[PDB]
Coordinates of all heavy atoms in Angstrom, one line a residue:
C203 N 2.0 -0.2 -9.0 CA 3.2 0.2 -9.8 C 3.3 -0.9 -10.8 O 3.7 -2.0 -10.6 CB 4.5 0.1 -8.9 SG 5.9 0.6 -10.0
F204 N 2.8 -0.6 -12.0 CA 2.7 -1.5 -13.1 C 4.0 -2.3 -13.4 O 5.1 -1.6 -13.6 CB 2.2 -0.8 -14.4 CG 0.8 -0.5 -14.3 CD1 0.4 0.9 -14.2 CD2 -0.2 -1.4 -14.4 CE1 -1.0 1.2 -14.2 CE2 -1.6 -1.1 -14.3 CZ -1.9 0.2 -14.2
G205 N 3.9 -3.6 -13.3 CA 5.1 -4.4 -13.6 C 5.9 -4.8 -12.3 O 6.7 -5.7 -12.4
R206 N 5.7 -4.0 -11.2 CA 6.5 -4.3 -10.0 C 5.7 -4.8 -8.8 O 5.9 -5.9 -8.4 CB 7.3 -3.1 -9.6 CG 8.3 -2.6 -10.7 CD 9.7 -2.6 -10.1 NE 9.7 -2.5 -8.6 CZ 10.8 -2.1 -7.9 NH1 11.9 -1.7 -8.6 NH2 10.7 -2.0 -6.6
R207 N 4.8 -4.0 -8.3 CA 4.0 -4.4 -7.2 C 2.8 -3.5 -6.9 O 2.6 -2.5 -7.5 CB 4.9 -4.4 -5.9 CG 5.8 -3.1 -5.9 CD 5.2 -2.0 -5.1 NE 6.0 -1.6 -4.0 CZ 6.2 -0.4 -3.6 NH1 5.7 0.6 -4.4 NH2 6.9 -0.1 -2.6
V208 N 2.0 -4.0 -5.9 CA 0.8 -3.3 -5.5 C 0.9 -3.0 -4.0 O 1.4 -3.9 -3.2 CB -0.4 -4.1 -5.8 CG1 -1.7 -3.5 -5.2 CG2 -0.6 -4.3 -7.2
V209 N 0.6 -1.8 -3.6 CA 0.6 -1.5 -2.1 C -0.8 -1.1 -1.7 O -1.5 -0.4 -2.4 CB 1.6 -0.3 -1.9 CG1 1.3 0.4 -0.6 CG2 3.0 -0.9 -1.7
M210 N -1.2 -1.5 -0.5 CA -2.5 -1.2 0.0 C -2.3 -0.6 1.4 O -1.5 -1.0 2.2 CB -3.5 -2.3 0.0 CG -4.0 -2.7 -1.4 SD -4.7 -4.3 -1.6 CE -3.3 -5.3 -1.2
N211 N -3.2 0.3 1.8 CA -3.1 0.9 3.1 C -4.4 1.7 3.4 O -5.4 1.7 2.7 CB -1.9 1.8 3.2 CG -1.3 1.9 4.6 OD1 -1.9 1.5 5.6 ND2 0.0 2.3 4.6
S212 N -4.3 2.4 4.5 CA -5.4 3.3 4.9 C -4.7 4.5 5.6 O -3.6 4.4 6.1 CB -6.3 2.6 6.0 OG -5.6 2.2 7.1
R213 N -5.3 5.7 5.5 CA -4.8 6.9 6.2 C -5.9 7.3 7.1 O -6.9 7.7 6.7 CB -4.5 8.0 5.2 CG -3.7 9.1 5.8 CD -3.2 10.1 4.7 NE -4.3 10.8 4.0 CZ -4.2 11.3 2.8 NH1 -3.1 11.2 2.2 NH2 -5.3 11.9 2.3
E214 N -5.6 7.1 8.4 CA -6.6 7.4 9.4 C -6.1 8.6 10.3 O -5.0 8.5 10.9 CB -6.9 6.2 10.2 CG -7.0 5.0 9.3 CD -7.1 3.7 10.1 OE1 -7.3 3.7 11.3 OE2 -7.0 2.6 9.4
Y215 N -7.0 9.6 10.4 CA -6.6 10.8 11.2 C -5.3 11.3 10.7 O -4.4 11.7 11.5 CB -6.6 10.4 12.7 CG -8.0 10.4 13.2 CD1 -8.7 9.1 13.3 CD2 -8.8 11.5 13.3 CE1 -10.1 9.1 13.7 CE2 -10.1 11.5 13.7 CZ -10.7 10.3 13.8 OH -12.1 10.3 14.1
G216 N -5.2 11.4 9.4 CA -4.0 11.9 8.7 C -2.8 11.1 8.7 O -1.8 11.5 8.2
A217 N -2.8 9.9 9.3 CA -1.6 9.1 9.3 C -1.8 7.7 8.6 O -2.8 7.1 8.8 CB -1.2 8.8 10.7
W218 N -0.7 7.4 7.8 CA -0.8 6.1 7.1 C -0.6 4.9 8.1 O 0.1 5.1 9.1 CB 0.3 6.1 6.1 CG 0.1 6.9 4.9 CD1 0.7 8.1 4.6 CD2 -0.9 6.6 3.9 NE1 0.1 8.6 3.4 CE2 -0.8 7.7 3.0 CE3 -1.8 5.6 3.6 CZ2 -1.6 7.8 1.8 CZ3 -2.6 5.7 2.5 CH2 -2.5 6.8 1.6
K219 N -1.3 3.9 7.9 CA -1.3 2.7 8.7 C -0.3 1.7 8.2 O 0.6 2.0 7.5 CB -2.7 2.1 8.9 CG -3.5 2.7 10.1 CD -3.4 4.2 10.0 CE -2.7 4.7 11.3 NZ -3.3 4.1 12.5
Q220 N -0.6 0.4 8.6 CA 0.2 -0.7 8.2 C 0.1 -1.0 6.7 O -1.0 -1.4 6.3 CB -0.1 -1.9 9.0 CG 1.1 -2.7 9.5 CD 1.2 -4.0 8.7 OE1 2.2 -4.8 9.0 NE2 0.3 -4.3 7.8
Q221 N 1.2 -0.8 6.0 CA 1.2 -1.0 4.6 C 1.1 -2.5 4.2 O 1.8 -3.3 4.9 CB 2.4 -0.4 3.9 CG 2.3 0.0 2.5 CD 3.6 0.4 1.9 OE1 3.8 1.6 1.7 NE2 4.4 -0.5 1.6
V222 N 0.4 -2.9 3.2 CA 0.3 -4.3 2.8 C 0.8 -4.3 1.4 O 0.4 -3.4 0.6 CB -1.2 -4.8 2.8 CG1 -1.2 -6.2 2.3 CG2 -1.8 -4.7 4.2
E223 N 1.7 -5.2 1.1 CA 2.3 -5.2 -0.3 C 2.1 -6.6 -0.9 O 2.2 -7.6 -0.3 CB 3.7 -4.9 -0.2 CG 4.4 -4.9 -1.5 CD 5.9 -5.1 -1.4 OE1 6.3 -6.3 -1.2 OE2 6.7 -4.2 -1.6
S224 N 1.8 -6.5 -2.2 CA 1.6 -7.8 -3.0 C 2.5 -7.7 -4.3 O 2.6 -6.6 -4.8 CB 0.2 -7.9 -3.4 OG 0.0 -9.0 -4.3
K225 N 3.0 -8.8 -4.7 CA 3.8 -8.8 -5.9 C 3.0 -9.4 -7.0 O 3.4 -9.5 -8.2 CB 5.1 -9.7 -5.7 CG 5.9 -9.2 -4.5 CD 6.8 -8.1 -4.9 CE 8.3 -8.4 -4.8 NZ 8.9 -8.9 -6.0
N226 N 1.7 -9.8 -6.7 CA 0.8 -10.4 -7.7 C 0.6 -9.3 -8.8 O 0.2 -8.2 -8.5 CB -0.5 -10.7 -7.0 CG -1.4 -11.6 -8.0 OD1 -1.0 -12.0 -9.0 ND2 -2.6 -11.7 -7.5
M227 N 0.9 -9.6 -10.0 CA 0.8 -8.6 -11.1 C 0.1 -9.1 -12.3 O 0.7 -9.4 -13.3 CB 2.2 -8.1 -11.4 CG 2.3 -7.1 -12.5 SD 1.4 -5.6 -12.1 CE 2.0 -5.3 -10.4

């Protein structure tokens, strides 16, 4: 999300896992 944050994750067997968030921009 330009200017705000970055989110990382994985979707396994149709379900989103533990979201990881960074404010590094």
Side-chain angles (χ1 to χ4, degrees):
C203 175
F204 289 110
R206 298 238 336 198
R207 43 91 121 135
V208 173
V209 154
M210 283 164 298
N211 212 341
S212 57
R213 188 169 66 203
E214 316 171 11
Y215 282 100
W218 286 106
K219 270 48 245 307
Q220 222 250 179
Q221 207 185 259
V222 178
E223 181 206 73
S224 170
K225 305 277 242 94
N226 190 10
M227 182 59 46

